[PDB]
Amino acid sequence: ISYAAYLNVAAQAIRSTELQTASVLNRSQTDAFYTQYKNASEPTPITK
Amino acid sequence: AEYFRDEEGQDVLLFIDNIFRFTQAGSEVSALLGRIPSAVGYQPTLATDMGLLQERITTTKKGSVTSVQAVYVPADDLTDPAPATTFAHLDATTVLSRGISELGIYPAVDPLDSKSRLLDAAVVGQEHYDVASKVQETLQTYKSLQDIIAILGMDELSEQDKLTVERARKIQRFLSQPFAVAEVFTGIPGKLVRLKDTVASFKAVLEGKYDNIPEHAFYMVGGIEDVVAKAEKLAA
């Protein structure tokens, strides 16, 4: 639980839903994936 | 030749420079004789005439006739019926093009326009057949992908396509060998390599056991060992 995760979520929350400027919608909750790996072995991609 | 093969029972050979010259000379006389030479400007008795020549040099129990036949290609295309008909009476071709001469590879023999009815998986054995099969296939992918490779560079394409491109380039330079009588012209010493050696040298290359080392290591060398040494010569 990073400091920037906390501010991010506080931000995302002020933005709600789509009735906000475009930049706002882009800085929060647009899909993407991040595939973790280890060391190889890999935790399966889950939503951004 | 026939006198040698039959009566005397000798093992014979024949080499001809050039057999195309038989059709051409014959075509001049064809009009005069009483024949209409239409077949893209050739005698209509082509089949019958090439047939008698190439069947009088056909293997007998009295003596086997190894032929080497030399074909002048009319206006650099093999499509006309007279270059085509030669392929009909042959069991091997090792076609040499203009293009491989320009690329600076001597000999100028095409790898993908070579044939034998001598290559099978137990005629020359399992290793020879596997090794030839990977070579033909690799090379055919590299020409097929030449529009795409050239138009869009080779740090923009896939992992698989770059690995082929580097392998095929290495085989391309490898095909260069100066011969015992060609050594003069290139200025690179003659290289005489065995068939048994060739299978080995290529099996190793195909498995990528010498593709971590210059493509010019393989320029104008014989077999694998000749390649290895020249890389160190090139390095220093």
Added chain:
Amino acid sequence: GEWFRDNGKHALIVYDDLSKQAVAYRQLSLLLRRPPGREAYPGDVFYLHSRLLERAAKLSEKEGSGSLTALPVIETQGGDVSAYI
């Protein structure tokens, strides 16, 4: 091939090369001063092949239980298919 088919027994005919029949017949036609069609090949080459090919066929068992089946083979020049033969 037909003799087998006639008595009641099936057969199959592989024709390598029909392409060479056409080379041979070209020689014949042009030294017999019979007009050509396209590419110096005879006027009525197709008629010689066509009748020939339809003698492979399945007949009815009342009139011979056999069939001759045919596979002609044409060895093409530069993989070409827009020429007459």
Added chain:
Amino acid sequence: ATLKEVEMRLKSIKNIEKITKTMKIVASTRLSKAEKAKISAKKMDEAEQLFYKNAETKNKELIVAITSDKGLCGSIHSQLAKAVRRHLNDQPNADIVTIGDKIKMQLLRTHPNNIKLSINGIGKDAPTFQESALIADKLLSVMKAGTYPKISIFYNDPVSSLSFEPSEKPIFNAKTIEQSPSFGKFEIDTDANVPRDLFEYTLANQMLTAMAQGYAAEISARRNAMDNASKNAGDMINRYSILYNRTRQAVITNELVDIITGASS
């Protein structure tokens, strides 16, 4: 024949030309946006940079590299992988975070023993904070980031809106802010936990600036490359078109020759 084989290939080349032309337009479109983003990020970075200068900060190691999912953007994709391998001589056991599909495959191959975190979705749209923030969070868990003596990032600085030079900087750690001045030219006692918190918010702001710079530089390369592409497909049209013209004439001639040959004889 000759004729048809000439033609079908000349047709492929034509189709290629039409696509590379469309691609180059699409790239300028994307490019304007890509430029827009990087201004705004850099402006935000300079306020944080301001602090970093006065604080004089300046110090295991990380490698980060940036690409899209999309191929066809210069040699950005393989010079950046080569720049990772250079900074892998600076720390062989470094943790490679690969941002984008194109960079992922090549580094994953050389060491799956260095691949820890990797991303996707960099190519469809220009980088956004959401990505950066979550990746910064995951940076603490996986790499144990913020205890390193140095962190480093790689990207392509878009020197002019038609050029790209690859460039690097070092991300200043939380450990660094603690032990340089931050009470000696600023003032924080022990009330908040400003160092470990400022590191984490600014891990993403600095990471995001590099993401934007790299992505912008990248579309400029795809634009430059696609202009040259059209021109090359165009050169090829010209060699095969002259070849076609001659071939097509060879049929005409050959039918003409057959007629004459018979009538005359």
